[PDB]
Amino acid sequence: KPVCLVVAMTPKRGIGINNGLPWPHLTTDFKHFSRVTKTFNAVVMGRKTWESMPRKFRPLVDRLNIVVSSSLKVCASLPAALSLLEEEYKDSVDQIFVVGAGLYEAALSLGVASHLYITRVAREFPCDVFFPAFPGDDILSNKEATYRPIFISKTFSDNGVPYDFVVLEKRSSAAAIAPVLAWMDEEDKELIRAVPHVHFRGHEEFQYLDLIADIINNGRTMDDRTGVGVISKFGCTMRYSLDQAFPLLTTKRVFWKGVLEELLWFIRGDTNANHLSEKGVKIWDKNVTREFLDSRNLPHREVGDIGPGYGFQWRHFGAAYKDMHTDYTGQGVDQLKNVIQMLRTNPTDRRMLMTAWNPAALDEMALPPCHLLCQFYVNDQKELSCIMYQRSCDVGLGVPFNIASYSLLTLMVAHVCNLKPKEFIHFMGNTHVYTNHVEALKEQLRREPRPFPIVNILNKERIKEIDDFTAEDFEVVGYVPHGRIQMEMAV
Amino acid sequence: PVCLVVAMTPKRGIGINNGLPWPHLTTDFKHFSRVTKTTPASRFNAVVMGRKTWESMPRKFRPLVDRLNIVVSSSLKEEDIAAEKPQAEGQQRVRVCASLPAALSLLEEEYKDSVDQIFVVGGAGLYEAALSLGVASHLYITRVAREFPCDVFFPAFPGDDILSNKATYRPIFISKTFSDNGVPYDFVVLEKRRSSAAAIAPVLAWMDELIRAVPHVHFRGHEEFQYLDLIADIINNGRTMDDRTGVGVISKFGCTMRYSLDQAFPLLTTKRVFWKGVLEELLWFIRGDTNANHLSEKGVKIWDKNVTREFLDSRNLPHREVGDIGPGYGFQWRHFGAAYKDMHTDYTGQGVDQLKNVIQMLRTNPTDRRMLMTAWNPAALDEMALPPCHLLCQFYVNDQKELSCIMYQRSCDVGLGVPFNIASYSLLTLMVAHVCNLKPKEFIHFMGNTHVYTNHVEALKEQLRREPRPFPIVNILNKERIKEIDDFTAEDFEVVGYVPHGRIQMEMAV
Numbered sequence A: 001k002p003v004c005l006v007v008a009m010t011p012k013r014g015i016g017i018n019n020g021l022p023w024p025h026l027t028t029d030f031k032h033f034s035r036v037t038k039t040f041n042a043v044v045m046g047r048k049t050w051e052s053m054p055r056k057f058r059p060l061v062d063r064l065n066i067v068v069s070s071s072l073k074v075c076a077s078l079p080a081a082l083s084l085l086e087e088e089y090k091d092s093v094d095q096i097f098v099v100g101a102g103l104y105e106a107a108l109s110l111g112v113a114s115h116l117y118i119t120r121v122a123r124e125f126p127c128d129v130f131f132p133a134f135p136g137d138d139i140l141s142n143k144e145a146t147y148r149p150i151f152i153s154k155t156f157s158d159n160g161v162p163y164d165f166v167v168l169e170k171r172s173s174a175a176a177i178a179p180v181l182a183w184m185d186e187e188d189k190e191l192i193r194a195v196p197h198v199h200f201r202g203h204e205e206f207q208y209l210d211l212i213a214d215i216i217n218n219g220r221t222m223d224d225r226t227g228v229g230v231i232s233k234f235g236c237t238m239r240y241s242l243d244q245a246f247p248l249l250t251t252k253r254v255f256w257k258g259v260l261e262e263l264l265w266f267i268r269g270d271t272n273a274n275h276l277s278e279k280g281v282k283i284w285d286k287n288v289t290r291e292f293l294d295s296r297n298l299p300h301r302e303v304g305d306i307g308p309g310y311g312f313q314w315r316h317f318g319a320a321y322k323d324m325h326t327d328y329t330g331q332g333v334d335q336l337k338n339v340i341q342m343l344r345t346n347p348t349d350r351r352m353l354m355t356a357w358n359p360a361a362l363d364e365m366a367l368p369p370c371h372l373l374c375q376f377y378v379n380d381q382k383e384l385s386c387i388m389y390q391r392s393c394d395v396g397l398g399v400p401f402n403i404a405s406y407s408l409l410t411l412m413v414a415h416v417c418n419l420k421p422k423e424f425i426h427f428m429g430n431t432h433v434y435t436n437h438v439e440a441l442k443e444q445l446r447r448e449p450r451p452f453p454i455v456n457i458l459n460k461e462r463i464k465e466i467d468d469f470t471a472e473d474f475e476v477v478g479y480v481p482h483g484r485i486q487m488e489m490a491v
Numbered sequence B: 001p002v003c004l005v006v007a008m009t010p011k012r013g014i015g016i017n018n019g020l021p022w023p024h025l026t027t028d029f030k031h032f033s034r035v036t037k038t039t040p041a042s043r044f045n046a047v048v049m050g051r052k053t054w055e056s057m058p059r060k061f062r063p064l065v066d067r068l069n070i071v072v073s074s075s076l077k078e079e080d081i082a083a084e085k086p087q088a089e090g091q092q093r094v095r096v097c098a099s100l101p102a103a104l105s106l107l108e109e110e111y112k113d114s115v116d117q118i119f120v121v122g123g124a125g126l127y128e129a130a131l132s133l134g135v136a137s138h139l140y141i142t143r144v145a146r147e148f149p150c151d152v153f154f155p156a157f158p159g160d161d162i163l164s165n166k167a168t169y170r171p172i173f174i175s176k177t178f179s180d181n182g183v184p185y186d187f188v189v190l191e192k193r194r195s196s197a198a199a200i201a202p203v204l205a206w207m208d209e210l211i212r213a214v215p216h217v218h219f220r221g222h223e224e225f226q227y228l229d230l231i232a233d234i235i236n237n238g239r240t241m242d243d244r245t246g247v248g249v250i251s252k253f254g255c256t257m258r259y260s261l262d263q264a265f266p267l268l269t270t271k272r273v274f275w276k277g278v279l280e281e282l283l284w285f286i287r288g289d290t291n292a293n294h295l296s297e298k299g300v301k302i303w304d305k306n307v308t309r310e311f312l313d314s315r316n317l318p319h320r321e322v323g324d325i326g327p328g329y330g331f332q333w334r335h336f337g338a339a340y341k342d343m344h345t346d347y348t349g350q351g352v353d354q355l356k357n358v359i360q361m362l363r364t365n366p367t368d369r370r371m372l373m374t375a376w377n378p379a380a381l382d383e384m385a386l387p388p389c390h391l392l393c394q395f396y397v398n399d400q401k402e403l404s405c406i407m408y409q410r411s412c413d414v415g416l417g418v419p420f421n422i423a424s425y426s427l428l429t430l431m432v433a434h435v436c437n438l439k440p441k442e443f444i445h446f447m448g449n450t451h452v453y454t455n456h457v458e459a460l461k462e463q464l465r466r467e468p469r470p471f472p473i474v475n476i477l478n479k480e481r482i483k484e485i486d487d488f489t490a491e492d493f494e495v496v497g498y499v500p501h502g503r504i505q506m507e508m509a510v
């Protein structure tokens, strides 16, 4: 006699308002509901919940319907509803479902619900009816029997609303092949793993989490420039979808403002880190101090001057660098402008690359570029995709930031080229985890990911060229991450 | 139901002078032991061999422990074997039969409920007989890639195309290439053909949804299956797009392969690869040479079609002498940023020597994360005959002084160029590793615009019907003479055990 609850709730567990739905229509969510609820099967709903549905849908087809009330033309309680399912319908019924509040709380207090099919609406909406609090609430936001998640899906989106799908539970020729696989596997301590209780791992952040796990379990312990020491692998790959949502990581809060401002910085081709630091974005400071510049044999550099790096190569590749106050307009190659031009005139060209790796300028820069190359790609559906190669990856600190950065860049380019963002492909060379990050990361790996937010470009009508973007033309919608996890930057 | 187990040269050789044709193959021996011994308690396995095989085995190892030993002979007797060495406790007494049917009859008559599997172990006579009777269900074949002097050969059997070029025995298992004592080899298995979590499958059911290379091969350990599956995947899921050349293309974006370099060399075997080409062109790169004619008059015409007067003009470069590729690949490698003139100019000391940089950094500071070589220089692109495809490579060293290399390729002609590139940068990795006193571990292939040309699709479809052969071994000769990257010549290499399929004609998209 098992029972399952099927729901769609906000992070604040809101499910309704004015006897209806808080959010605009969620197509994929409805397909999910309709598919899950049938394989006949039975659905049980409250009095008002039956009224919430349009008349043309009210008899939920191919499923035994059970309204519970004491007024209408149908059981008088949830236990009665179950009894009606046990006595008759004992044959032909498979599993049961419960689909409003009070019925949910009845099912929970009576402790009959074994599994929870929750649709995590990432956005909050005005509500007057909420899903009851329960052990496992951690899966919605940062608020003995307990509900452990087992299924976490890819982030979907409809009408500007991002959401997830999670499932919770209460807590001859092979024989011939076998003995060879045996000895081949034999040769060759305790494997760590991102939230192992989750068997069906559809969320794209599991790429990152499993990357961390794989590096900790299968990497080599090495030294480096910083003297901190790392655990590293070589040649790693991720890729994040961009059509439904935005890969702003959720297992820890990512410095979005930092991402955005640093990217706008890059695009302007600014090499002055003080412009970043004065906006509260001080990700560059420790690498543009007098001490570090002097360690780089650059005593003639002003504090803040990152030299001819990243942006300067982007907009003025091969140009002679003076200082962070010099106007380099017209000089060098404008890789960004060329990439955009070729995108807008001839998208089938396979030479649409932007490089930051200039051997003739390396020694002149504060830090050699990590993300040193990106390449763009269009298909027949006007869908833009971007590959970014990274020579060196601080998995704990820098990688999420980079994902966000180049995904954002892809969004912007896609907008100014009348293209639809599709995918960001992340290619990584030296992929390493700093030894003084390991424990914090092991803390992070116990966190189940939340729905990806969607990033909207505001004032699209006003924005026609890549230079036209400002720090106020973006909104981050439906971002519900775990708490910040502090990690010191190995200088 | 009997299984045969063998080790074999491409020309089906298995022995010489009542011994093995090759040096000791330890992993092959481990394979043999584990295959012939492992039982799920009560029963043991039986091994049946000919007299000469028994005599070929060393005294200490015979009879094969924990296995019932049956010898087919007419001259030998059971007491001949019994008086050869005292039977150890717990072991079975060695039996002697006058034929294979006699062996099997014995096995059924007084070893039922006693033995599990029956393995024919050698030699040519027993293999021949076993194939004649049709009792052989599976063949455990250890394909040795090198050819050796042999006076005894495994018989000809339908489906022996898994050895060399020409009811059936089709492969179901093909492993990665191992190597011992300069001998490359792999293992294949032929077959005679002629509400815990379950309640969550419905959500999987609505999130759930043609061409495949050699689908009968269930275990696909061979690393060439990366390439084959890459082809099949591009064909099935790729998008048909227009193209710079006018020929149609089917493309995907963001593709990954990686090949091992510690055991053998990834010179693709499902078609013959122009090794002379990859070698000469790589040396050509290292010299910083921009003169395609130097490649052409050595028999490597791979650049001609892109350095013709016509093409050079279509590139808006009438000033270029025929054959001058401009400031590309090698030129950026050895002289990045240097001002170009022509292919006859001396450039020593000009620009950045990325190769020497990388090598020195490898020899002195192997944990540096800036070991890169790039040929993508936006300034000199319009001066080049063709913008670099393999445009960037990065190196890596770990615990055990092992070198790994990633190469990023913006554009990838899968059918034509990709194998050549693989071979190329794998070779580069070998050379660099030798020059830096390191062990080659891995070449990693990162691919941007990955595509096949529409005039190649039929040929690739043809190519996917071929199961791969053991990877060869690329030996560096005259190591003592070679101390620097420039010290290499064309005769300092040796491809060993390369047994590829026939060439497949595919015209270059101009």
Ligand SMILES: NC(=O)C1=CN([C@@H]2O[C@H](COP(=O)(O)OP(=O)(O)OC[C@H]3O[C@@H](n4cnc5c(N)ncnc54)[C@H](OP(=O)(O)O)[C@@H]3O)[C@@H](O)[C@H]2O)C=CC1
Pocket (backbone or CB within 6 Å): A006, A007, A008, A009, A014, A015, A016, A017, A018, A019, A020, A021, A045, A046, A047, A048, A049, A050, A052, A068, A069, A070, A071, A072, A076, A077, A078, A099, A100, A101, A102, A103, A106, A129
């Ligand atoms: N987002 C989502 O997934 C879903 C949202 N909703 C939303 O929820 C709201 C409807 O839920 P809610 O307003 O809580 O009302 P319900 O639809 O759950 O029904 C409440 C009525 O059902 C009867 N009832 C419920 N529980 C019991 C009980 N334990 N014993 C006896 N009778 C019971 C009572 O009828 P009587 O007075 O006749 O005794 C009561 O007035 C709407 O806003 C709806 O749109 C609904 C379903 C799913």
Ligand SMILES: NC(=O)C1=CN([C@@H]2O[C@H](COP(=O)(O)OP(=O)(O)OC[C@H]3O[C@@H](n4cnc5c(N)ncnc54)[C@H](OP(=O)(O)O)[C@@H]3O)[C@@H](O)[C@H]2O)C=CC1
Pocket (backbone or CB within 6 Å): B005, B006, B007, B008, B013, B014, B015, B016, B017, B018, B019, B020, B049, B050, B051, B052, B053, B054, B056, B072, B073, B074, B075, B076, B098, B099, B100, B121, B122, B123, B124, B125, B126, B129, B152
């Ligand atoms: N690489 C590999 O996988 C293997 C290689 N080898 C090599 O092969 C060589 C030995 O093979 P080979 O020379 O063919 O010798 P075999 O091992 O086949 O032995 C031949 C002898 O066995 C008896 N015999 C074999 N078949 C029959 C039959 N059908 N009917 C009756 N009697 C039979 C006869 O014994 P009698 O004369 O006593 O009557 C015959 O002289 C050696 O070089 C060995 O090292 C062997 C096994 C595996």
Ligand SMILES: Nc1nc(=O)c2nc(CNc3ccc(C(=O)N[C@@H](CCC(=O)O)C(=O)O)cc3)cnc2[nH]1
Pocket (backbone or CB within 6 Å): A006, A007, A008, A029, A030, A031, A033, A034, A049, A052, A053, A054, A057, A060, A061, A099, A117, A118, A119
């Ligand atoms: N995850 C979840 N999402 C929901 O929207 C939801 N809604 C309810 C109650 N509201 C409704 C409103 C309309 C229909 C409905 O018309 N269903 C049809 C159409 C499915 C479709 O549009 O594809 C059905 O036959 O399933 C169902 C439930 C209960 N549990 C839920 N659970």
Ligand SMILES: Nc1nc(=O)c2nc(CNc3ccc(C(=O)N[C@@H](CCC(=O)O)C(=O)O)cc3)cnc2[nH]1
Pocket (backbone or CB within 6 Å): B005, B006, B007, B028, B029, B030, B032, B033, B036, B053, B056, B057, B058, B061, B064, B065, B121, B122, B140, B141, B142
């Ligand atoms: N695949 C294959 N490889 C072989 O070398 C081979 N050799 C023979 C005949 N020659 C020999 C000679 C010695 C031993 C031997 O001593 N074998 C040990 C393996 C040692 C180990 O455990 O690694 C055994 O116990 O089987 C076996 C076969 C027959 N079939 C073969 N089949």
Ligand SMILES: Nc1nc2[nH]c3cccc(Sc4cccc5ccccc45)c3c2c(=O)[nH]1
Pocket (backbone or CB within 6 Å): A255, A258, A283, A284, A287, A394, A397, A398, A399, A401, A489, A490, A491
């Ligand atoms: N070891 C190491 N060095 C780094 N240098 C950086 C320069 C700019 C951004 C970055 S990435 C970054 C991204 C987000 C937050 C950060 C906070 C402090 C320091 C760096 C942050 C780095 C960076 C890094 O992430 N790790």
Ligand SMILES: Nc1nc2[nH]c3cccc(Sc4cccc5ccccc45)c3c2c(=O)[nH]1
Pocket (backbone or CB within 6 Å): B274, B277, B302, B303, B306, B386, B413, B416, B417, B420, B508, B509, B510
């Ligand atoms: N469509 C297409 N155009 C190409 N132009 C090239 C210029 C240099 C090498 C190459 S790739 C290549 C490189 C070296 C040898 C080859 C031998 C036969 C076929 C291709 C070879 C190309 C090339 C290509 O592979 N495909």
Ligand SMILES: O=c1ccn([C@H]2C[C@H](O)[C@@H](COP(=O)(O)O)O2)c(=O)[nH]1
Pocket (backbone or CB within 6 Å): A225, A367, A368, A370, A371, A392, A393, A394, A395, A397, A398, A399, A402, B369, B370
């Ligand atoms: O965007 C960035 C910038 C820096 N880093 C990290 C990677 C390396 O830890 C370090 C650079 O040091 P070298 O690779 O230059 O030695 O900074 C990133 O992951 N992403």
Ligand SMILES: O=c1ccn([C@H]2C[C@H](O)[C@@H](COP(=O)(O)O)O2)c(=O)[nH]1
Pocket (backbone or CB within 6 Å): A350, A351, B244, B387, B389, B390, B411, B412, B413, B414, B417, B418, B421
């Ligand atoms: O080493 C090489 C050189 C060239 N090409 C192919 C890729 C493209 O199909 C073709 C033409 O170049 P673009 O149109 O991508 O420039 O050359 C390779 O695959 N590998």
